[PDB]
Amino acid sequence: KNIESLFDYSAGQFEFIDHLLTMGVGVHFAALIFFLVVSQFVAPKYRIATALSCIVMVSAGLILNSQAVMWTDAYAYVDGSYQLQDLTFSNGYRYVNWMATIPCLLLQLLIVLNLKGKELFSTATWLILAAWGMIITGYVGQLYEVDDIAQLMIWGAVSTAFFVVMNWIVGTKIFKNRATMLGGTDSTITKVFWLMMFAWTLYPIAYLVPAFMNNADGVVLRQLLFTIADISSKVIYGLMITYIAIQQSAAAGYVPAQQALGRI
């Protein structure tokens, strides 16, 4: 059902995708240790934001590791190329994982924006429903990326409408609550918004590769785009969130955060 199953791969293509996925595992688990160790410098009111980064690192790291092993299970070197065997490889497992990781990425943003109480709960609910609508309609669309490109496009348009509305909610909350943020992080948080807009827009570009580059090099490109996007949207983003959490912690008087920042 997916374009990966259509092609034999050169050794260079096959090895490069394997190395991409494996490097992605290493980066996420390396970053996990960082977020774990610095969580003791985050004030209680923000510490869940850094815990969420830990959860996202393991969740994303496990899906990338599962994809890497599925890639090597599915293909074997036969008659000079990597050819599909009895098991298949597909990107559908990424979509299922996004059902958990996208809410985690959004929730840590809302925590450092200082939303609390009812506004936090209600903003998180609408965001998570919009994200789940995006993910589910995209998952259906990519079931047709070989059989029915028209259908891929239409479900992709519906998914993109949820994406746009979600981003509208996020941006409205950022620009509305910028003013509450401590330690100069009202300037930082706007950069986080732009980082999200850039990095999350790479996923719909990967989703469209079947329409514009249906060949083995398009398969490689899609995994390359996922890799750039994953590291940007989860690791670099989490580092910025953690920086904002620690900076606001210090400005609110949390002594471990003041001492951590002073040490650098």
Ligand SMILES: *C/C=C(C)/C=C/C=C(C)/C=C/C1=C(C)CCCC1(C)C
């Ligand atoms: C770490 C994973 C992240 C940040 C996943 C982000 C996924 C998206 C923003 C998916 C977006 C889509 C569209 C906007 C339309 C095409 C179908 C999707 C689901 C790929």
Ligand SMILES: CCCCCCCC/C=C\CCCCCCCC(=O)O
């Ligand atoms: C900011 C996140 C960066 C993600 C790092 C991804 C690493 C990509 C490295 C450079 C790509 C150049 C490699 C050449 C690909 C050869 C294709 C082939 O083997 O046929």
Ligand SMILES: CCCCCCCC/C=C\CCCCCCCC(=O)O
């Ligand atoms: C086994 C896979 C091979 C690749 C292993 C990767 C080794 C880790 C390298 C750096 C990962 C980038 C994340 C950096 C952690 C945050 C620390 C910081 O920059 O302040």
Ligand SMILES: [Cl-]
């Ligand atoms: Cl606190």
Ligand SMILES: [Cl-]
């Ligand atoms: Cl993920």
